[PDB]
Amino acid sequence: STGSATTTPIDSLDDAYITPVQIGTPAQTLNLDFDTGSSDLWVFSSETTASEVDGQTIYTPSKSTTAKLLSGATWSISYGDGSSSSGDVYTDTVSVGGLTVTGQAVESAKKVSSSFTEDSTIDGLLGLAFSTLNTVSPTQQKTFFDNAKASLDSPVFTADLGYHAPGTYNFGFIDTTAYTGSITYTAVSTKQGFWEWTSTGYAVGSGTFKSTSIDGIADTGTTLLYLPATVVSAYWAQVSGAKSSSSVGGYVFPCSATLPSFTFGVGSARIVIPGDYIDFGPISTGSSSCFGGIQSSAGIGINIFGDVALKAAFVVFNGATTPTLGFASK
Ligand SMILES: CC(=O)N[C@H](CCc1ccccc1)C(=O)O
Ligand code: NA
């Protein structure tokens, strides 16, 4: 089997991407944030505290003939941005882009933090990291991908995120029309439960490539590119008037600037992030300080190849027994 679903930016900055997901019988379609940095499929629901719902579509298990309470199971998750959610668990039928899993754990939110409430466009998350990170207790649950894996034509999914445009998540096949040149595969560690790999270095604009190992995660659920402070300082040093602002909490730059590209290495291959991908717009409405898309990881504890980096590539998440990542230009 395979599946193929379009993923759409939630706003004009590509802050996140939503993908429609069918849950239950008859189908209830919710728009979920597919997150390769977490392992819970959770949704706004008929159980979510009413004051914490503001415009989201909710899953109502009582209206699904295939929903079953997973008795005694609870979940609670905290993300890198400080947001959180928690609740109880149902099993139900979940379909993405024509690919169906029966008995998927659908984590129903009783509580969500303010950042989720305030984002009316995201109805929940679909985690695509390794199932070792799943937060369901006392019986950990599998991701949609791990449940689908044995049924797929090939044990893979691909992320093809758009720049200010829709893109695609495919499951079970690699669309050879969706990328240029060849795909370069690189090793993954699952030791922390993430799609963790080591980039071979970077370049700023038309500068020389610096060969240096940068260990980080491929995370579709993070907007920006978070790299070591040395690398980030070298990038922003090429933008007149750019500075790190502890008031704003990152590098900002004059909105009048033209940004240089940023290249990262995947083995001997190179992925180029155009400068425009690194512009996240005025910090507050009407400001001429713009927020940067490359930020320091020094206050995180891990480097994160978020959407700024991933949307410059066609990315293969290869979940064979020995997982790998692949990157192609597009
Ligand atoms: C150095 C690099 O970019 N790739 C190699 C092979 C990665 C690999 C492993 C198994 C099957 C296909 C590919 C590596 O990271 O060890
Ligand atoms: Na922000």
Amino acid at 327: F
Residue ranges per domain, the chain?
5-174, 175-330
Name every residue whose Cβ is closer than 8 Å to that of residue 275 and which is 6 or more positions away in sequence.
205, 258, 259, 260, 261, 262
187 CA to centre of ligand 1 in angstroms: 5
Task: Give burial (CB, 10 Å; 0-12/13-18/19+) of 284.
Answer: exposed
Alpha-carbon torsion angle 26, 29, 35, 40, nearest 10 = -40
Q: Which of 174, 185, 188 to mutate to test the pocket of ligand 1 (most atoms within 8 A of CB)?
A: 185
> Three-state DSSP class for 271?
strand
Q: CA angle 242-245-246, nearest 5°?
A: 160
What ligand has the least distance to the C-alpha of 283? 2
Residue of the CA atom closest to atom 2 of ligand 1: 186
Query: Rounded to an integer, what distance in angstroms lies between the CA atom of residue 62 and that of residue 58?
Result: 12
Give phi and psi for 199, each to the nearest 5.
Answer: -70, 150
Active-site entry in 14, 35, 119, 123:
35
In sequence order, what DSSP letters do the residues of 137-178 get, joined into one string? BSS----HHHHHGGGSSSSEEEEE--SSS-EEEEES---TTS
**Active-site annotation holds for 261:** no
Do 113 and 83 touch, CB atoms closer than 8 A? yes
Residue holding tokens 């990291």?
129
Domains 5-174 and 175-330 share a fold: yes
Domain 175-330's class? mainly beta
Query: Rounded to an integer, what distance in angstroms lies between the CA atom of residue 2 and that of residue 144?
Result: 13
Amino acid at 142: K
DSSP state of 36: T
Query: Rounded to an integer, what distance in angstroms lies between the CA atom of residue 156 and that of residue 188?
Result: 14
| Alpha carbon distance, N-terminus to C-terminus of the chain | 25
**Active-site annotation holds for 35:** yes
Do 226 and 303 touch, CB atoms closer than 8 A? yes
Do 71 and 56 touch, CB atoms closer than 8 A? no
Resolution of the PDB structure in angstroms: 1.0
Fold of 5-174: Cathepsin D, subunit A; domain 1 (2.40.70)
58 CA to centre of ligand 2 in angstroms: 26
Pocket of ligand 1 (CB under 6 A): 184-187, 267, 322, 324
Q: CA angle 263-264-268, nearest 5°?
A: 110
Query: Rounded to an integer, what distance in angstroms lies between the CA atom of residue 279 and that of residue 292?
Result: 6
Active-site entry in 39, 64, 108, 199:
199
Written as six digits, the tokens of 298 are 């020094």
Element holding 231 (H helix, E strand): helix 229-236
Residue of the CA atom closest to atom 6 of ligand 1: 186
Pick the atom of ligand 1 nearest to 184's CA: 3
